[PDB]
Amino acid sequence: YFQGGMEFLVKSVRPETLKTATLVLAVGEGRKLGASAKAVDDATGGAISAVLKRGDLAGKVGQTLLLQSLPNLKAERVLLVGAGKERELGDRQYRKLASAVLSTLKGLAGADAALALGDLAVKGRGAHAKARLLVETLADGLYVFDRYKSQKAEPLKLKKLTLLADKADSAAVEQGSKEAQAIANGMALTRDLGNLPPNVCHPTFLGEQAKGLAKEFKSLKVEVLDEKKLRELGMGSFLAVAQGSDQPPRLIILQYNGAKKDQAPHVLVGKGITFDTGGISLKPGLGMDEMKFDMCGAASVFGTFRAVLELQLPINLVGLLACAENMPSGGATRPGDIVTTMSGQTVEILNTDAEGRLVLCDALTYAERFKPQSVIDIATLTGACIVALGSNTSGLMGNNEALVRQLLKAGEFADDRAWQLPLFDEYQEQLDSPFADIANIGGPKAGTITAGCFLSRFAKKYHWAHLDIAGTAWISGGKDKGATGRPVPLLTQYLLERAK
Amino acid sequence: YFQGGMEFLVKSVRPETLKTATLVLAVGEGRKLGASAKAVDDATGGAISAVLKRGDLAGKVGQTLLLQSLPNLKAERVLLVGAGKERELGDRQYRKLASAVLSTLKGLAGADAALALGDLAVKGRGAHAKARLLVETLADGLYVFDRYKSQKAEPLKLKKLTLLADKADSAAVEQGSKEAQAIANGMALTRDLGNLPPNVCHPTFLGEQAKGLAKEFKSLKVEVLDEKKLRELGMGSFLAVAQGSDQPPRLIILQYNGAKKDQAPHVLVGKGITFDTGGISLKPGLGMDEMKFDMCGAASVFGTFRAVLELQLPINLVGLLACAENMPSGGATRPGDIVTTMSGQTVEILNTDAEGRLVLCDALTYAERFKPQSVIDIATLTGACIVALGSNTSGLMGNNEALVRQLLKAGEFADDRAWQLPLFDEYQEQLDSPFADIANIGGPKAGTITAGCFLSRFAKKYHWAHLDIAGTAWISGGKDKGATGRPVPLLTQYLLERAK
Ligand SMILES: [Cl-]
Ligand SMILES: [Cl-]
Ligand SMILES: [Cl-]
Ligand SMILES: [Cl-]
Ligand SMILES: [Cl-]
Ligand SMILES: [Cl-]
Ligand SMILES: [Cl-]
Ligand SMILES: [Cl-]
Ligand SMILES: [Cl-]
Ligand SMILES: [Cl-]
Ligand code: NA
Ligand code: NA
Ligand code: NA
Ligand code: NA
Ligand code: NA
Ligand code: NA
Ligand code: NA
Ligand code: NA
Ligand code: NA
Ligand code: NA
């Protein structure tokens, strides 16, 4: 169940007799009230119709009108929210409607609210799929990160949200709500870890977080490998990234065995660069505070595990979090260094700011021992991905078409979308080095793709895919600056489908 | 038939008795000679086997060994070319093999050569598909642009190439060769127009080129509209691009009616910015000579027409070439100008270097009058596409999934590949303007996509797709700097399939 201060219930009772602090109804733009709103209007003797006739609420998506006590209702307030003029909403409009409702309710002193929104239609979504989107939007919309504020906002009075559904849909709605709550809990852990400042959130801290998660979930086993063990394993490019920082690196291994021992596991590999200065290839100063989000890949592995552990899915899951801090220093890796990866391939490190792939490639080699049926790495890897796909769609590459399709489908269902980019063999020659087996960077052309090509050289032994979340893992500026928790919804949906 | 100084023949005779200046045979790396090479070796009494045993030719793809007269052969020379160790070649290896053969033959004084390469296997390609790739690579490999060199290279002695094929395959090979020759002729026209310097290749020159093509092909009708007519049509954003230059703009209309009058036409829309300084939003000086390639979109419409006209395909085809020169001047368009497009939508021109879309959008509105069944615009539009997809894969967007799939399939067959990028509705808000209906640029995120989103607002009335060839239309540096002729092979293959 959701942990962020909200209980979500599903009930099949009549809205017009439900006791609640706020009853929420949808109002169309220039079309008749839906069945639920009409039943409530009838119960009040036409009071809602009479208000709407006065014209303050045009009915555009997300517009609101709040009424107090109406005759013959047990609702203390009635919140009208506009649903536009279309027969069906798209996902974006449904989310906008839900967020407008939540924003209003947050500011009220009501301890609960009941959503009578079952008459809304959303393109391509039945009861379960609508509940997944609605509850995830509501629950994630409650997220707060204020532990470093001396002045904290007043706690919400709102503590309970009831979804009204016809009895024939209530089981699907309940299922969707339960899954959405687990996803939102995972997103909240991901966002917390992403938002923590890098002087607190370093690799050792992430190791202790993993141990704490195992304390909470007896089904989770955790092992944390330090720099001595990494050197024993021959993890040369991983160590090269870490060596310039005072902070020691960590390889965190999470294991959950929800299925029979004969089922091959799915492996999630997360880039956990807790801060990325670029190293000797130093980044510019402007906006470099957002490099604390360079561990959002690893954070999303935490969050996906958190959701899976709550749902107790019948799957075998492994998490590999490759965490290091990338700092300049008198002992840092230099451009031109050549290192031997755990696979034995030598890499010429042309640019020390292309370091995510250097911790990932050793983790991908490590993943071979699990004989996985799928391996997915998640990383804030290339600014080129933002040029290619922006901030709303993650880049996706892989060496197996069926797995890539499974991830695309999961992202569509989750409304946490990705988009495939090709790993054509012609791109690989961009990584040729006169000195070593591989150069760690290509040119300025196709940067997201050549990063995927680099990783692919370590993933040939299994079905593998790669999510570039450089654009989707956080919001850069404004009031809403901070980690997003993506791609936890995509990944959790992928695993939900693999668990059937 | 190919016009660049080469006759291509298909014959089904035995290689070992064929009179030719050079007989070309494939030699595998560490595997037995194929059937054709073995038959020739047997005819010489083992002379080729005996040479190969000495070890000078390892057999790697494209390696060569040239022999002179061998016993009992009518070939004056025998050229051995390595074919690697795989059972089947990929497209890249097949092209590399063919280019190595051609490079050797170019340097010889032989007037002809015979290719006995029928035993080569290429992944996913039968006789017709292999001949398409082989002949197009050979014919396009003969391209020369030397009209501004005072010292021209010696003319080739090689004037005839014979493809040897089994009688059961010879019809397919002949068909593939004929189509490849037409494509190569079209590519040569495209490359010529792209390579011409911008003080020669201006919009008026392109208009005269269209008139010259109609003189050569009686099935082509051409109309050239000048700035007065553009202003009568209300083509405000097109005129805004052109107004800073001394060179007047041209809208060139090509029409070919190869099918019954009841068949809706296919429309190709080409960006013909004959030079792009950026305008007031001036480009940096470094590499700005390659902005003469900013008309390669329009050039590829010329080239696709040239191939279609030679093949006399039973289709109805329209070409719209929107040509202008983008110059700074005391009357040039300024950042912040607002103009009314022919569609009536107003556009705020935030950056005068995003000018390709401003001539294209008026051409897309113009295309409505043809009631087309497909509209494809081709443009060197965004440097962001090179970041996203590099120099080897064109970006593709559209408003119709079936058309996008048809173009992807054509590019795969042609080995002139594209890759779809999404036009999700969420990207559209990047083009919001406080002052006008549309801004002409989004932010630094998803630049290729937001350019496609801008064009999509003018294409809603028909099935439309958009090819960003900023990366594939030319080669930037080195000995091979110059226009490539892409995407003529993709477009011609698309139309070949639509003609069935
Ligand atoms: Cl249901
Ligand atoms: Cl630790
Ligand atoms: Cl340690
Ligand atoms: Cl974006
Ligand atoms: Cl799914
Ligand atoms: Cl055949
Ligand atoms: Cl003209
Ligand atoms: Cl004129
Ligand atoms: Cl490239
Ligand atoms: Cl095709
Ligand atoms: Na609507
Ligand atoms: Na929507
Ligand atoms: Na970096
Ligand atoms: Na990084
Ligand atoms: Na490059
Ligand atoms: Na081979
Ligand atoms: Na190949
Ligand atoms: Na430009
Ligand atoms: Na341009
Ligand atoms: Na942007």
UniProtKB/Swiss-Prot annotation, chains A, B:
Mn(2+) 1 binds at D276, D353, E355. It is found in: Cytoplasm. It catalyses: Release of an N-terminal amino acid, Xaa-|-Yaa-, in which Xaa is preferably Leu, but may be other amino acids including Pro although not Arg or Lys, and Yaa may be Pro. Amino acid amides and methyl esters are also readily hydrolyzed, but rates on arylamides are exceedingly low; Release of an N-terminal amino acid, preferentially leucine, but not glutamic or aspartic acids. Its EC number is 3.4.11.1, 3.4.11.10. Mn(2+) 2 binds at K271, D276, D294, E355. SUPFAM superfamilies: Macro domain-like (SSF52949), Zn-dependent exopeptidases (SSF53187). GO terms for molecular function: manganese ion binding; metalloaminopeptidase activity. Coiled coil: none annotated. The keyword Transmembrane does not apply. Keywords: Aminopeptidase, Cytoplasm, Hydrolase, Manganese, Metal-binding, Protease. PANTHER family: CYTOSOL AMINOPEPTIDASE, LEUCINE AMINOPEPTIDASE-RELATED. Belongs to the peptidase M17 family. Presumably involved in the processing and regular turnover of intracellular proteins. Catalyzes the removal of unsubstituted N-terminal amino acids from various peptides. This is Probable cytosol aminopeptidase. The lineage of its organism: Bacteria, Pseudomonadati, Pseudomonadota, Gammaproteobacteria, Pseudomonadales.
